[PDB]
Ligand SMILES: CCCCn1cc(CCCSC[C@H]2CN(Cc3c[nH]c4c(N)ncnc34)C[C@@H]2O)nn1
Ligand SMILES: CCCCn1cc(CCCSC[C@H]2CN(Cc3c[nH]c4c(N)ncnc34)C[C@@H]2O)nn1
Ligand SMILES: [Mg+2]
């Protein structure tokens with residue numbers, strides 16, 4: 001049987017996932033998370049929100065893999081746009097991810113780099129190819145690019161522009177890199193999907209509060225369409 | 231259950247080398263999630279030793295693996311740290327009373343720095359283990375300080391950042407893993423003790439000081455950690 005892990009960061013990012021799948025879920029508490037376990041089209045689906053940020057998302061992804069035996073992990077949620085062509089509600093699939101707030105420059109390491117790791121973490125080529133194929137079939141724009149993750153909500157021109165100049169990132173969030181990193185360490189295929197909620201600038205807090213629901217639903221609907229192909 | 235299982239963590243290989251040597255028992259090496267776990271028996275206790283690799287994500291992963299895959303009932307962390315206070319000198323030992331993720335910033339939503347919804351700024355460690363540390367330090371006639379440790383994904387090497395950590399969090403030392411290790415332990419209800427020996431002063435010379443004192447400071451912490459395990 002296929003076991004698929006489905007993650008968001010916030011409750012609001014998984015509410016539409018649970019609703020759209022429309023099946024009965026058993027709630028299983030572990031490590032401060034609640035995992036929603038159900039069956040959908042001959043697949044076991046395990047849905048959870050990690051809570052915000054890198055430590056939360058690292059923990060939850062590790063629990064999904066070790067405790068629930070998931071064979072793939074699909075992340076769905078919202079993100080800040082760093083580029084003019086990614087508008088509110090647009091979908092992005094992460095090709096690579098970086099931890100943008102990592103700084104070991106005192107030892108002459110590039111920003112984002114940790115010894116025994118890499119700046120950029122890869123996601124699954126096969127899953128990203130699937131996303132692109134289905135987006136083309138649905139006539140929805142799906143961009144691909146680098147996502148930057150850190151433990152700060154970005155809401156300034158200065159920081160946005162650093163993420164673009166340093167990492168060539170297209171979007172910013174607080175969990176993708178950690179989720180993809182854990183999946184890489186365990187050899188588990190990972191796809192990170194995000195819908196834009198804000199422009200990561202001085203108005204981002206207000207934009208985020210306004211568009212979280214709609215953008216979360218947009219990502220959730222696309223994630224469901226991916227699970228339908230697995 | 232019926233057997234005691236103790237997880238022992240460092241961040242870097244250099245922090246666990248003296249731990250493995252000092253325990254002096256045979257370890258089985260078990261690979262999982264990009265870590266190697268060293269599993270042995272010591273004084274009727276199962277000990278599982280690993281280095282996580284540097285920073286918050288690495289240490290979160292490894293601690294979660296220790297708990298879920300190896301069933302550890304306690305986690306003891308040993309390693310080095312930057313001093314933020316004049317009375318913590320190179321080689322001095324500190325036990326963390328509470329820890330904070332100093333680089334967390336959700337201030338755009340009016341949250342205090344360090345705070346994430348559904349969590350807390352300060353993460354507590356085990357009172358019983360910290361009390362044990364203080365008791366044995368007094369017996370050994372070694373100075374053991376206690377205080378707040380700040381953890382983030384930056385090596386701190388500036389006056390400006392040091393002073394922020396003191397003013398914002400009243401931190402005594404800085405490192406890149408303690409808060410994440412303690413956080414994971416809290417989520418799983420596992421007692422945690424974080425021990426650090428000072429390697430540098432988290433200032434403009436910290437890189438050079440760290441390279442000089444990593445080995446000695448790591449050994450100082452490892453030796454103290456072993457003395458704790460001897461009392462469990
Ligand atoms: C949850 C408790 C209820 C009260 N409450 C809600 C909140 C909201 C905290 C949201 S932190 C951000 C989320 C969204 N998410 C993506 C994101 C979108 N835009 C971003 C940006 N500009 N910078 C960084 N990340 C983002 C990151 C984090 O999970 N604070 N208190
Ligand atoms: C396997 C190849 C390793 C090659 N290599 C080693 C290195 C050194 C990286 C060291 S990062 C720092 C370690 C030590 N440790 C504690 C620490 C002590 N002082 C601190 C300070 N001032 N600020 C923050 N943290 C510290 C954090 C991290 O594990 N770079 N390349
Ligand atoms: Mg088809």
Ligand SMILES: [Mg+2]
Nearest residue numbers: 393394396397
């Ligand atoms: Mg001052």
